[PDB]
Design a binder for this molecule. Structure first.
Ligand SMILES: CO[C@]1(C(=O)O)C[C@H](O)[C@@H](NC(=O)CO)[C@H]([C@H](O)[C@H](O)CO)O1
Ligand code: NA
Length: 163
């Protein structure tokens, strides 16, 4: 794919703005985490199908965090954005994406971190307003690709329909 740079291996990096980071995880757990080290700690976790409400432990920024999660779906995996605004506070859950292809994407743009949400094949975007957004450093725990924003409809197509 001429619009799909990669695959790249799990790494810690400061993504450039206006680029979608297309994530291709395999198992349940932490997909990606990122922070500005001031007032936003954001991660995305992945939940396999058929998970009744339960406490699960996730390794987030080097510590054990217990979260109450669920995936009702039988056919779709669930991405959940988790976010805290202070180093010592609680994570809250936002912008879930129920996904058949098992693909996710994040982007730093216009004061925000954008992710996908909703239900494939009709997924939309949401965002998290982030102080000094372009400073956000990210660790991907899975293989990933890069797509420019000017080709967002293509990133959206990948999110909805897979590679
Ligand atoms: C308070 O405003 C916002 C934000 O502009 O950040 C609005 C945004 O739509 C929302 N996104 C979503 O819920 C999902 O995409 C986001 C979020 O709830 C918080 O940032 C989490 O701390 O809050
Ligand atoms: Na999301």
């Amino acid at each position: 794919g001429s619009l799909l740079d990669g695959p790249y291996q799990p790494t810690t990096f400061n993504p450039p703005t206006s680029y979608w980071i297309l994530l291709a995880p395999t198992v349940e757990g932490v997909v990606i985490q990122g922070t500005n080290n001031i007032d936003r700690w954001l991660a995305t976790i992945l939940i396999e199908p058929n998970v009744q409400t339960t406490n699960r432990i996730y390794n987030l920024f080097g510590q054990q965090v217990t979260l109450s999660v669920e995936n009702t779906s039988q056919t779709q995996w669930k991405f959940i954005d988790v976010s805290k605004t202070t180093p010592t506070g609680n994570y809250t859950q936002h912008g879930p994406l129920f996904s058949t292809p098992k693909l996710y994407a994040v982007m730093k743009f216009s004061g925000r971190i954008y992710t996908y949400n909703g239900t494939t094949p009709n997924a939309t975007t949401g965002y998290y307003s982030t102080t000094n957004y372009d400073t956000v450093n990210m660790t991907s725990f899975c293989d990933f690709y890069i797509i420019p924003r000017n080709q967002e409809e293509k990133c959206t197509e990948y999110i909805n329909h897979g590679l």
